[PDB]
Structure 1
Amino acid sequence: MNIFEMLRIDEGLRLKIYKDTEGYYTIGIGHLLTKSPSLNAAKSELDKAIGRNTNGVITKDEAEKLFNQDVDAAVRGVLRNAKLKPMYDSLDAVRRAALINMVFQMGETGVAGFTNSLRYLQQKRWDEAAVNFAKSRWYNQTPNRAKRIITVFRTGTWDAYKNL
């Protein structure tokens, strides 16, 4: 298990434009195209992202390319985020993956919104952080996924992903 395998489990892989859990146009492995209601706008984003005129469909290789970019960006971003660096630097590799997962899903802003939980994490108060994380729109809207991430934070193991 690693960040890629983990996110691949959580986001799936779709080669044609689809709508994510929030109703937003997305493609590949959870690559958000735009929050716009416009399919045309989403297709324009796609083309720009890939570098060609696609008509809403990409190859797997293409999908993995955006995915690789997205995970890298996720990491790079956290590493230069003040609200997040310290807590992330404080974590072990497993829990770091969980943190990266949440940023990929919701963005730095969204993740920094979890101030209290982050703090318990920084304190290494595992169960407390776990409880706190669950008190969120995030957990209510994506409970299965949220529960998986929370277990990782709690335990520092990949068990929750262990057979997905």
Structure 2
Amino acid sequence: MNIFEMLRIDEGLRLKIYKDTEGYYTIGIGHLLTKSPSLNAAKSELDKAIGRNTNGVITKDEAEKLFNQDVDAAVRGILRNAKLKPVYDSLDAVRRAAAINMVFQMGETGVAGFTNSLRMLQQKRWDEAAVNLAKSRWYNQTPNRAKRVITTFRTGTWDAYKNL
């Protein structure tokens, strides 16, 4: 298990434009195209991302290319964020993956409200952190995925994924 396999489980793989859990146009391995309700706007974003005129369908290779870029972008975003970098630096590699997972799903704007959780994670108060993380829109809207990510933060193991 690693961040790539982990996110592949959580996001799936679809080669045609689909709507994510929030109703937003997405493709590949959870590559958000746009929050716009316009399919044409989404197709434009896709074309721009891939570098060719696609009309809504990509190859597995192309999906994996965007996925690698997105994982990279998530890590780089954490390291450039003053609130996130210290907590990330304080973590072991397994829990770092859980961190990347969250940023991948919600972005930095989505994780802005996790200040108290972040403190508890840096303190390594794993059970308390886990309890706090679940008190969120995130957990309520995507409970099964949140549960996996939280278990990863709680235990520092891949137990929530090793079976999947």
Fold match (TM-score > 0.5): yes
Identity %: 96
Matches of 1:145 and 1:118, distance apart in 2: 19
Runs of 4+ that moved beyond 3 A: none
Q: What is the alpha-carbon root mean square deviation over aligned residues?
A: 0.5
1:109, distance to aligned residue in structure 2 (A): 1.9
CA offset digits 1:59-97 (Å, max 9, x no partner)? 000000000000001101101110100001000000000
CA offset digits 1:92-128 (Å, max 9, x no partner)? 0000000000000000121232000110000000000
Q: Which residue does the alignment assign to 1:96?
A: 96
- The TM-score with structure 2 as length reference comes to 0.99
Gaps of 5+ in 2: none
Matches of 1:31 and 1:6, distance apart in 2: 15
Bigger mean CA offset, 105-114 vs 39-48? 105-114
CA offset digits 1:10-43 (Å, max 9, x no partner)? 0000000000000000000000000000000000
Matches of 1:75 and 1:56, distance apart in 2: 27
Mapping for residues 39-78 of structure 1, pairs under 5 Å: 39-78=39-78
- The TM-score with structure 1 as length reference comes to 0.99
Matches of 2:144 and 2:2, distance apart in 1: 19
CA offset digits 1:138-159 (Å, max 9, x no partner)? 0000000000000000000000
Q: Which residue does the alignment assign to 1:153?
A: 153
How many residues are aligned here? 164
